[PDB]
Amino acid sequence: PVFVSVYLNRSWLGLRFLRALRLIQFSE
């Protein structure tokens, strides 16, 4: 655990919410 929240958190500002928005919306 704490492996997705850390990757979906830094991605929010790491890629203007693009690096995470593609990982949180891909699962559907």
Curated annotation (Swiss-Prot):
Subcellular location: Cell membrane
Outcome, altering R22Q: Induces reduction in the coupling between calcium and channel opening
Variant or mutagenesis effect after changing E28K: No effect in the coupling between calcium and channel opening
UniProt effect for mutating R16E: Induces reduction in the coupling between calcium and channel opening
Topology feature Extracellular, residues: 5-8
Source species, domain of life: Eukaryota
Tissue-level expression: Widely expressed. Except in myocytes, it is almost ubiquitously expressed.
Listed result of changing L13 to R/H: No effect in the coupling between calcium and channel opening
Family the entry assigns: Belongs to the potassium channel family. Calcium-activated (TC 1.A.1.3) subfamily. KCa1.1/KCNMA1 sub-subfamily.
Linked pathology: Paroxysmal non-kinesigenic dyskinesia 3 with or without generalized epilepsy: An autosomal dominant neurologic disorder characterized by absence seizures, generalized tonic-clonic seizures, paroxysmal nonkinesigenic dyskinesia and involuntary dystonic or choreiform movements. Onset is usually in childhood. Patients may have seizures only, dyskinesia only, or both.
Function: Potassium channel activated by both membrane depolarization or increase in cytosolic Ca(2+) that mediates export of K(+). It is also activated by the concentration of cytosolic Mg(2+). Its activation dampens the excitatory events that elevate the cytosolic Ca(2+) concentration and/or depolarize the cell membrane. It therefore contributes to repolarization of the membrane potential.
Remaining remarks: The protein was initially thought to contain two functionally distinct parts: The core channel (from the N-terminus to the S9 segment) that mediates the channel activity, and the cytoplasmic tail (from the S9 segment to the C-terminus) that mediates the calcium sensing. The situation is however more complex, since the core channel also contains binding sites for Ca(2+) and Mg(2+).
Domain notes: The S0 segment is essential for the modulation by the accessory beta subunits KCNMB1, KCNMB2, KCNMB3 and KCNMB4.
Name of this chain's protein: Calcium-activated potassium channel subunit alpha-1
Gene: KCNMA1
